[PDB]
């Protein structure tokens, strides 16, 4: 009944090695521990994914190439996803952790299982993309489908959850919902509100394009409106929730103007459904703020209010100069015009009935 927390020292050390987010996994874990939240969770060591498990989504040829590059030094590698030594073992660890979380849920060990180091939502069956070499979210959804008939995937990262959406574009058994920045030239370029899925999957992809500067109140109003409609229309049996913290004020992506409180309200709205829920991280490039966000959201999962004062711990100096948990929104414009948001929400509302 207690939430599962996917963690081991070797897993955190592996995750600390991704160059866009050095030490982020240790920062997240050590802040969670500084707030004593691990004592309220069941710690489960992640398994490493086998190539057989990875091949439930990724192609045989992509997995051969990933292994080759990982040993030696095409398929989306080189720029955002450099072809570097060890990438296959890193992929296998992250994929394995999300699979392990899903297995805990299908086994009934818990109703919430947390892998903050997962959420690599851009990777495609045969292409690395957007820092993502393996789509652990897809692998977790596929594992949940062993026991749960309909899976709802909700993606609150700043970026469109394109790889997950594409994986399930043609099916009605998985519904994907992404809220994201959508603007010319902004990665990955997809996910306008008219992106609804294909074939029998038509209307089983939902996309909410949002502009710079959104704040907690409006974001929650949007998310709540969409999720209420999705729940009633789709009746999910399990949820996979990607909580990339690159929406939070102070992120180098410098787009949205959110705080963890607003994301937390979205999370609580989903938790009220009392379904098996797999919690993932994702983006989040202000490392201390990402740790603040995911620690706060762990508290939300546990029903716990945390002290504003960051407890002393190994990474204390990263939390200066304020050393508090709350994040102050920046002073920038909210570029979301009310009547454009109305148009977006009304379109989605009609598509879901």
């Amino acid at each position: 009944l207690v939430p599962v927390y996917i963690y081991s020292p070797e897993y955190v050390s592996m995750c600390d090695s991704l160059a866009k987010i050095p030490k982020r996994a240790s920062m997240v874990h050590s802040l969670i521990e500084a707030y004593a939240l691990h004592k309220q969770m069941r710690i489960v060591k992640p398994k490493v994914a086998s190539m057989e498990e990875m091949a439930t989504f990724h192609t045989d040829a992509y997995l051969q190439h990933l292994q080759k590059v990982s040993q030696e030094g095409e398929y989306g590698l080189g720029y955002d996803c450099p072809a570097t030594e060890g990438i296959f073992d890193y992929a296998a660890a992250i994929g394995g952790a999300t699979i392990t979380a899903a297995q805990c849920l299908i086994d009934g060990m818990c109703k919430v299982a947390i892998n903050w180091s997962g959420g690599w939502h851009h990777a495609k069956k045969d292409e690395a993309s957007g820092f993502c070499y393996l789509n652990d979210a897809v692998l977790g959804i596929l594992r949940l489908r062993r026991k749960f008939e309909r899976i709802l995937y909700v993606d609150l990262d700043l970026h469109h959850g394109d790889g997950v959406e594409d994986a399930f574009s043609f099916t009605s058994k998985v519904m994907t919902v992404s809220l994201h920045k959508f603007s010319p030239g902004f990665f990955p370029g997809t996910g306008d509100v008219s992106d609804v899925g294909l074939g029998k999957g038509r209307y089983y992809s939902v996309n909410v394009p949002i502009q710079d500067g959104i704040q907690d109140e409006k974001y929650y109003q949007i998310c709540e409106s969409v999720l209420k409609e999705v729940y009633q229309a789709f009746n999910p049996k399990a949820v996979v929730l990607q909580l990339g913290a690159d929406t939070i004020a102070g992120d180098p992506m410098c787009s949205f103007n959110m705080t963890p409180v607003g994301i937390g309200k979205c999370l609580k709205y989903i938790l009220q459904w009392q379904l098996a829920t797999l919690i993932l991280g994702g983006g989040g490039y202000n490392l201390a703020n990402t740790a603040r966000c995911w620690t706060y959201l762990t508290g939300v999962i546990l029903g716990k209010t945390l002290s504003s004062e960051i407890p002393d711990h190994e990474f204390f100096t990263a939390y200066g100069p304020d050393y508090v948990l709350e994040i102050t929104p920046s002073c920038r414009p909210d570029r979301n015009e009310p009547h454009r948001i109305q148009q977006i929400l009304n379109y989605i509302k009609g598509n879901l009935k």
Binding site: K20, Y79, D80, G130, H159, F187, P188
Partner: peptide, 4 residues
Amino acid sequence: FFXX
């Protein structure tokens, strides 16, 4: 970055 490049890219994303």
